[PDB]
Amino acid sequence: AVVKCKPTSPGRRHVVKVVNPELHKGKPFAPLLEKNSKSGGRNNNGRITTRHIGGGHKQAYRIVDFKRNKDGIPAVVERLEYDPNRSANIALVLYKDGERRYILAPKGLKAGDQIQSGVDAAIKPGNTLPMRNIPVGSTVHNVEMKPGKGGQLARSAGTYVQIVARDGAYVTLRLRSGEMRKVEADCRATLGEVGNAEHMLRVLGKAGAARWRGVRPTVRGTAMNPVDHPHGGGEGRNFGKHPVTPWGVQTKGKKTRSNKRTDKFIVRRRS
Amino acid sequence: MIREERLLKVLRAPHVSEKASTAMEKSNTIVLKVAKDATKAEIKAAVQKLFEVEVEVVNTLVVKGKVKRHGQRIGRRSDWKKAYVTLKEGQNL
Amino acid sequence: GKPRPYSPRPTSHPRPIRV
Amino acid sequence: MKRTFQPSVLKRNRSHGFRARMATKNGRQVLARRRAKGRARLTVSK
RNA sequence: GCUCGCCGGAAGACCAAGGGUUCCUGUCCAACGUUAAUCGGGGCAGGGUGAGUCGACCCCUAAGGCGAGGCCGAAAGGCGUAGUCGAUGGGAAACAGGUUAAUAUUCCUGUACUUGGUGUUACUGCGAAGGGGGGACGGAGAAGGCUAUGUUGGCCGGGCGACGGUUGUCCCGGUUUAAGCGUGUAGGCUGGUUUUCCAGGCAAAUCCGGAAAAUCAAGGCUGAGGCGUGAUGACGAGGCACUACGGUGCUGAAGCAACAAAUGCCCUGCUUCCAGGAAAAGCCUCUAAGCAUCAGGUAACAUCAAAUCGUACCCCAAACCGACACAGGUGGUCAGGUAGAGAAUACCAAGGCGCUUGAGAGAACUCGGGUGAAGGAACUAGGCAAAAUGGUGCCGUAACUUCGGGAGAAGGCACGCUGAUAUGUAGGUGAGGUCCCUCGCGGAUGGAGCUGAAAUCAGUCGAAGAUACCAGCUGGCUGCAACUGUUUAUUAAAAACACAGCACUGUGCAAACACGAAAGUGGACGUAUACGGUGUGACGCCUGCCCGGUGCCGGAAGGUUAAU
RNA sequence: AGGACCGAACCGACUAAUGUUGAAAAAUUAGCGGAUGACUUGUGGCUGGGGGUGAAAGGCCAAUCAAACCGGGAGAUAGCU
Ligand SMILES: *[C@H]1O[C@H](CO)[C@H](O)[C@H](O)[C@H]1NC(C)=O
Ligand SMILES: [Mg+2]
Ligand SMILES: [Mg+2]
Ligand SMILES: [Mg+2]
Ligand SMILES: [Mg+2]
Ligand SMILES: [Mg+2]
Ligand SMILES: [Mg+2]
Ligand SMILES: [Mg+2]
Ligand SMILES: [Mg+2]
Ligand SMILES: [Mg+2]
Ligand SMILES: [Mg+2]
Ligand SMILES: [Mg+2]
Ligand SMILES: [Mg+2]
Ligand SMILES: [Mg+2]
Ligand SMILES: [Mg+2]
Ligand SMILES: [Mg+2]
Ligand SMILES: [Mg+2]
Ligand SMILES: [Mg+2]
Ligand SMILES: [Mg+2]
Ligand SMILES: [Mg+2]
Ligand SMILES: [Mg+2]
Ligand SMILES: [Mg+2]
Ligand SMILES: [Mg+2]
Ligand SMILES: [Mg+2]
Ligand SMILES: [Mg+2]
Ligand SMILES: [Mg+2]
Ligand SMILES: [Mg+2]
Ligand SMILES: [Mg+2]
Ligand SMILES: [Mg+2]
Ligand SMILES: [Mg+2]
Ligand SMILES: [Mg+2]
Ligand SMILES: [Mg+2]
Ligand SMILES: [Mg+2]
Ligand SMILES: [Mg+2]
Ligand SMILES: [Mg+2]
Ligand SMILES: [Mg+2]
Ligand SMILES: [Mg+2]
Ligand SMILES: [Mg+2]
Ligand SMILES: [Mg+2]
Ligand SMILES: [Mg+2]
Ligand SMILES: [Mg+2]
Ligand SMILES: [Mg+2]
Ligand SMILES: [Mg+2]
Ligand SMILES: [Mg+2]
Ligand SMILES: [Mg+2]
Ligand SMILES: [Mg+2]
Ligand SMILES: [Mg+2]
Ligand SMILES: [Mg+2]
Ligand SMILES: [Mg+2]
Ligand SMILES: [Mg+2]
Ligand SMILES: [Mg+2]
Ligand SMILES: [Mg+2]
Ligand SMILES: [Mg+2]
Ligand SMILES: [Mg+2]
């Protein structure tokens, strides 16, 4: 549910929060927890390589099953859990052989519902089939790009992929970007849409809320001195330059894709 | 078992002071200057073998040497180890 | 002789600006 | 006011100590220069 | 030595860090000490730091470091795997009393506890670098039960007052006791137990996970405090004996209760929220290879071991960082009384100090304060500074508004003390006794004692009752920025920066992008509801016309055009 | 509940006076802002000089910053004093 906060303080007036009451209020499943210490957008040289990363809430990593290899064995969803590592909610599922795993929580999937992966899996949300066993026109998520590698396409809140055409050993996929891309027919997808579609309706409301999620302030180029950024300088607000990145590359329409290796798999771009 | 050669090199001197005198007449304890590398066990072996008395427990501390001046030339005395050696009820040294 | 001079220290008054 | 020298023996030894110098060729060249000059104290270690 | 003054959430006490003998004693006063100095953190000499339990070392990991091979790089080197280091975190155990000129959870006395080795005896499935459990974790809020601790009464010892009164509802002091061991309480969590099977837990598993019966519903885990013991002891106000007037020897009363009560404990709990809250070992359990009346395991008893290094002293400071015995800086711990909401503030206690030049004088002028006739912003760039406002309860409260606000708007009234209501009320607390009882640290009834607001009525003192300290000035019009934030360490705090929100644009994942000759790494263990870049800057209403120029994106008939 | 309100500790630094061979190479005194957060603080770690880091002031990077410090090229060069 999308609920608007009352304007009791100025920092709460604009806050819009996604209150999902079907989420596990208790602690997560310990066996599938790892530590992931923060980077601050700094690489192994200790240099900031991605700006605007730092601080925010301590987060444990949930080992999410993106592969869905455990096929032929039925699985029941125990509970939907909050995952701080991603926009999607995750489902704790118990297979009939005792093993528990986390999966991306698809739209509609609740506790009690049964999921199953493999070639002979049923065509319902949660179930993960090889995409040659999925009908054309179907809506799928957690789509593999190489057979066995695990889902890389359409993992974020309310995202999904349409199987538009099957040709030989390949299928054509309309991605959320609007891109028509070919993938190997063998590549596994999970049917449905990734849940928590109300994720984009949230309004952080105040500066601090961004600082909680680990985003540090963006300082505009035009607010700087010439030495710092091409947009730097001027007496008062000046510009008179073609908008560029901090490193001089034009930033208002200039295509930066340079991958002739994967061009063959692109049927049509977003444009 | 420790060699007599080693047991003859760990006791340097009896330590003479009011606290040593008081300890010897109050808590039947002898205060010894010992080798800086000597252990409580080696002190408890050496006193028993060289003074023919029965030792209850050895307590040790390291005395840090003082920084002294001799003709406006700075110098430092050596660190030494002090052993508080508690004898039994009736032994005497 | 003369001692090594001091690095800059706080100044009580601004130099007058003549322009 | 807080001044620039805030002593910590651990930081001192890790930053400037004998083993820190020995760890790199440039650090070993420091020791070589200081021995060549005939310093009584090669490093902060003492 | 007496008095006076000052601090007392410190200017007291205990530490870490840092320093390193500054500690204690004797002796000296050249220099050092902003003066003198007989004194000193100064000179000189001697002394002083005692640990199985405190800390380090040690076992274990975090960030991060190093890194066999390895990948990469003109060389130097870079990165990183297995590993191995790395606390600021996890991991066994000691308390009270006494003692030194100077150490003490370290010495002594009393009473404890922990871990491992060895031996004996009984009984026995033991075994890991592997599996599972556990360790193991957030913010906020709330309430109950408690203790530290305080107050008062009782009790005991002493007192009868330099000046009116003071044998009483009088005055002063004391009224302390630990770990451990036993008990298992307020509270918190969870349904036990048995059998059978199993695509899971790199193999196995009696363990964990899952499934299916059956029976019983009360079993287990956790837990402050209290109580008992520890303790016929220790401590103990004072008094009897020696005083080398520093301090030794000797004996020893009461040692209870009630009430109040933490920010400490139960509580790593409970409730709730979104921003979703280390790791690894010790520990517990499971088996594998292997070992089979052996090794090894469990329990009791006995014996042995627990090394090494730190331990003085300062530590909001004259000993650390500031060249100084420098009005600065410096993390943690302890937290008495009266008033008070309080760790504010005032005055005190314990304890510690009077800040290492003094003596006079009582000019101008400077500094820091107090008061001021009449006037009241006339001052001035500007009410700068100052003056003023200031508490609690009740009443009352505008435009405007995003309906929260604005608001403590503004403004008005009351306030001390005494008595009564009521020899102390409402409320809180709760003994004895009675009754029940699965019989105890229980339940119900019971209101002795204790504590105790607030209000009303009446009276009464002062110029003034919020009396001190403490403690909003208020209102109106308007620019800018929505807001809380951030900034020029050291002349700028703002209208600047950021900001949620908005838009454009890039980016299909070996992403764009960034750091890097490279390997790699960040982006992200993320995947277009995502990520980068850019501009704009909450919200509301909106965001028009122009694609010639310069970018960018796309097209391609020809023209020209590189190496070759 | 809250980047909510009043207000100590704590963090800061708006105004004034003092001080300016200072008590102090940035303070003191009286007022002042924040004070559950985009908070503050201890310990340790990482980022290195055309480089870092920067809620952006050319700020900060050991009392040094429109290119740190130290040594070297080095007796740079100086139609200038
Ligand atoms: C002192 O002079 C320096 C220049 O030498 C600066 O201007 C500084 O701001 C001055 N300070 C004062 C108080 O005028
Ligand atoms: Mg960014
Ligand atoms: Mg932005
Ligand atoms: Mg600027
Ligand atoms: Mg430029
Ligand atoms: Mg202009
Ligand atoms: Mg112009
Ligand atoms: Mg002992
Ligand atoms: Mg010792
Ligand atoms: Mg001359
Ligand atoms: Mg000395
Ligand atoms: Mg002294
Ligand atoms: Mg003198
Ligand atoms: Mg001295
Ligand atoms: Mg590591
Ligand atoms: Mg190598
Ligand atoms: Mg390496
Ligand atoms: Mg280690
Ligand atoms: Mg530590
Ligand atoms: Mg002492
Ligand atoms: Mg009590
Ligand atoms: Mg508190
Ligand atoms: Mg001490
Ligand atoms: Mg000082
Ligand atoms: Mg002084
Ligand atoms: Mg402080
Ligand atoms: Mg005070
Ligand atoms: Mg005068
Ligand atoms: Mg005056
Ligand atoms: Mg006045
Ligand atoms: Mg007047
Ligand atoms: Mg008047
Ligand atoms: Mg008037
Ligand atoms: Mg005027
Ligand atoms: Mg005038
Ligand atoms: Mg004023
Ligand atoms: Mg005033
Ligand atoms: Mg105007
Ligand atoms: Mg603003
Ligand atoms: Mg502000
Ligand atoms: Mg400034
Ligand atoms: Mg300023
Ligand atoms: Mg990568
Ligand atoms: Mg702007
Ligand atoms: Mg606030
Ligand atoms: Mg600042
Ligand atoms: Mg002030
Ligand atoms: Mg405020
Ligand atoms: Mg405040
Ligand atoms: Mg400028
Ligand atoms: Mg500087
Ligand atoms: Mg330059
Ligand atoms: Mg030359
Ligand atoms: Mg020259």
Residue numbers in the entry:
A (entry chain c): 2 to 272
B (entry chain s): 1 to 93
C (entry chain A): 1 to 19
D (entry chain 1): 1 to 46
Q: What's the publication's text?
A:
In addition to the termination complex, we observed drosocin bound to two other ribosomal particles—namely, a vacant 50S subunit and an elongating ribosome. This implies that, in the cell, drosocin could potentially interact with the 50S subunit after termination and ribosome recycling, when the 70S ribosomes are split into their component subunits. Similarly, the density for drosocin in the cryo-EM map of the 50S subunit was generally well resolved, except for the N-terminal and C-terminal regions. For the Dro1–RF1–70S and Dro1–50S complexes, the α-d-GalNAc modification linked to Thr11 establishes multiple interactions with U2609 of the 23S rRNA. Comparison with other E. coli 70S ribosome structures, including RF1 termination complexes, reveals that U2609 is usually base paired with A752, whereas, in the Dro1–RF1–70S and Dro1–50S complexes, α-d-GalNAc occupies the position of U2609, causing the base to shift away from A752 by up to 6 Å. Indeed, we observed that, on the vacant 50S ribosome, the α-d-GalNAc has also inserted in between the U2609–A752 base pair, causing a shift in U2609 as observed in the termination state. By contrast, the C-terminus of drosocin on the vacant 50S subunit appears flexible and less well resolved, presumably because the interaction with Gln235 of RF1 is absent.
The proline-rich antimicrobial peptide (PrAMP) drosocin is produced by Drosophila species to combat bacterial infection. Unlike many PrAMPs, drosocin is O-glycosylated at threonine 11, a post-translation modification that enhances its antimicrobial activity. Cryogenic electron microscopy structures of glycosylated drosocin on the ribosome at 2.0–2.8-Å resolution reveal that the peptide interferes with translation termination by binding within the polypeptide exit tunnel and trapping RF1 on the ribosome, reminiscent of that reported for the PrAMP apidaecin. In silico sorting of the data revealed three main populations of ribosomal states—namely, 70S ribosomes with RF1 and P-site tRNA (26%) or with A-site and P-site tRNAs (16%) as well as a population containing only large 50S subunits (30%), which, after refinement, yielded final reconstructions at 2.3 Å, 2.8 Å and 2.0 Å, respectively.
